[PDB]
Design a protein around this nucleic acid. Structure first.
Length: 468
RNA sequence: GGCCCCAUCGUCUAGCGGUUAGGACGCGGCCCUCUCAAGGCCGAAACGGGGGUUCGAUUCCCCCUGGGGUCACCA
């Protein structure tokens, strides 16, 4: 059938580049009613970040991607932690050895540095060791690596399903170490082993590993077994067209989540990174994507991640895709975080309704509608100026408000319009100073809803302090 | 630098031999209007250059240019 995967490396914060690839493997897989696996690349006992695996998988769920097999979501094909299958790589490496496709090397790291120094990179000198000698030194527990024995005089054909066939000159292909000294393998060794053993048919990965593919087709050759299809996604870039960097832009998914970004939005944004809907529609769901997916719709340029457009998307989602109920729910965590609290669900909802078009990130909500949840809100100069400037006619109005029985957006609007009229003045002239008295902002939703929402007592009392 | 991939508005992009080169973010303008938004309408904004090829190339080939990626046992 069709089997795609993601081999994430638990060596840092959950990367957005990881989501990018994941999103496309999930799509292709689902699009073909095939399987999609998660394989953890944890065979670097040096750059391993403990607690980094959980985060990656949680991050993947957060965006809405479900995988058919993986570390938590078990499966039929062996452990999904590259670390739990070291013995495998072991045997397969030995396999190539006692097969003429690999050889043991013993050069210490420094000698290699020297080898690389005096001459490009390693020169496969270890290829000159008699198998028995190498075998012996190995038996005597002498430290060494197991490098791929590339047929030096030759050429290797690679085929990107998106770019076509890219013939290579073995001269360009090194005898890459497969099994490291510590007995641990390299992406090269474990990817082909696990990809095949797990039955992956389509390898969708970052363009980053394009050039490394000829090593893989070679390995698939040595083991004597069918190569999968290869698709290389273009690398996401920093504003400076360079592949996304942690210090040139936010690459941590935990940051996006923290900054009040909707997973659905980020995911939808991610889709636009290469793929595009026939009808040019920019907003759609995960399923519509897995459904409209076609490699003939994938662009190959390097896309620059635009936080601006992302923000725009998050706002759009908040105001058109999610329901009021949905927003009011997601907004709470940010409320609690900002120290604010809401009186009731009803209150919160209406508060969220009036703000819906005024924030593009959940974080932005408790920020701009703070006065809606606490007495401890700031007062802008412009606001103070507008308040002081209108305090008089405000006093000339307070009694009317301390009187008005029908505390309704409709009613309140009538009184105020009447007021401004009877005072030979333009609405805004009464509305703004009041707005500033109530919110201390001058940048606020409608006056009548603000007036109303708070409630007669609540509203007047506050406006009283302002006039105080 | 060698090898390799890529190349339409500032950004994400549609295009498939013949278009007024479309859309979206961002930008500007007007409408709307109690403020700010949101929303609607309008506008500015692109095919890197040179040869081909073809009647016709943004569209196909090649070269240049430009951009990017990659050249590591982190034991």
């Amino acid at each position: 059938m069709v089997v795609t995967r993601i081999a994430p490396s638990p060596t840092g914060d959950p990367h957005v580049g990881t989501a990018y690839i994941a999103l496309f493997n999930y799509a292709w897989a689902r699009r073909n009613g095939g399987r999609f696996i998660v394989r953890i690349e944890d065979t670097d006992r040096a750059r391993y970040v403990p607690g980094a695996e959980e985060r990656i998988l949680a991050a993947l769920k957060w965006l809405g991607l479900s995988y058919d097999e993986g570390p938590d979501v078990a499966a039929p094909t062996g452990p999904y932690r590259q670390s739990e299958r070291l013995p495998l790589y072991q045997k397969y490496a030995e396999e190539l050895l006692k097969r003429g496709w690999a050889y043991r090397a013993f050069e210490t790291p420094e000698e290699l540095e020297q080898i690389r120094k005096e001459k490009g990179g390693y020169d496969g000198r270890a290829r000159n060791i008699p198998p028995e000698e190498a075998e012996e030194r190995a038996r005597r527990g002498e430290p060494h690596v197991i490098r791929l024995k590339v047929p030096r005089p030759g050429t290797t054909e690679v085929k990107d399903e998106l770019r076509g066939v890219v013939v290579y000159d073995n001269q360009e292909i090194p005898d890459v170490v497969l099994l490291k000294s510590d007995g641990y393998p390299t992406y090269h060794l474990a990817n082909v082993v696990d990809d095949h053993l797990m039955g992956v048919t389509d390898v969708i990965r970052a363009e980053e590993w394009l050039v490394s593919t000829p090593i893989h087709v070679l390995l698939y050759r040595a083991f004597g077994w069918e190569a999968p299809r290869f698709y290389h996604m273009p690398l996401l870039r920093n504003p400076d067209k360079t592949k996304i960097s942690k210090r040139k832009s936010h690459t941590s998914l935990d940051w996006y989540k923290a900054e009040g970004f909707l997973p659905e939005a980020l995911r939808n944004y991610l889709c636009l990174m290469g793929f595009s809907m026939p009808d040019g529609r920019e907003i759609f769901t995960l399923e519509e994507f897995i459904q409209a997916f076609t490699w003939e719709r994938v662009s190959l340029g390097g896309p620059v991640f635009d936080l601006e457009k992302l923000r725009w998307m998050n706002g759009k989602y908040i105001r058109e895709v999610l329901s009021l109920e949905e927003v009011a729910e997601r907004v709470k965590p940010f409320l609690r975080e900002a120290g604010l609290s809401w009186e009731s669900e009803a209150y919160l909802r209406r508060a969220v309704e009036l703000m819906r078009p005024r924030f593009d990130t959940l974080k932005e909500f408790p920020e701009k509608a703070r006065y809606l949840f606490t007495e401890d809100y700031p007062v802008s100069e412009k606001a103070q100026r507008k308040l002081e400037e209108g305090l008089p006619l405000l006093k000339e109005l307070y009694p009317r408000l301390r009187a008005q029985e029908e505390w309704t957006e409709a009613a309140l609007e009538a009184l105020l319009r009447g007021f401004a009229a009877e005072k030979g003045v333009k609405l805004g002239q009464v509305a703004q100073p009041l707005r500033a008295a109530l919110t201390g902002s001058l940048e606020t939703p409608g006056l009548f809803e603000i007036l109303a929402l708070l409630g007669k007592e609540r509203a007047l009392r506050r406006l009283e302090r302002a006039l105080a």
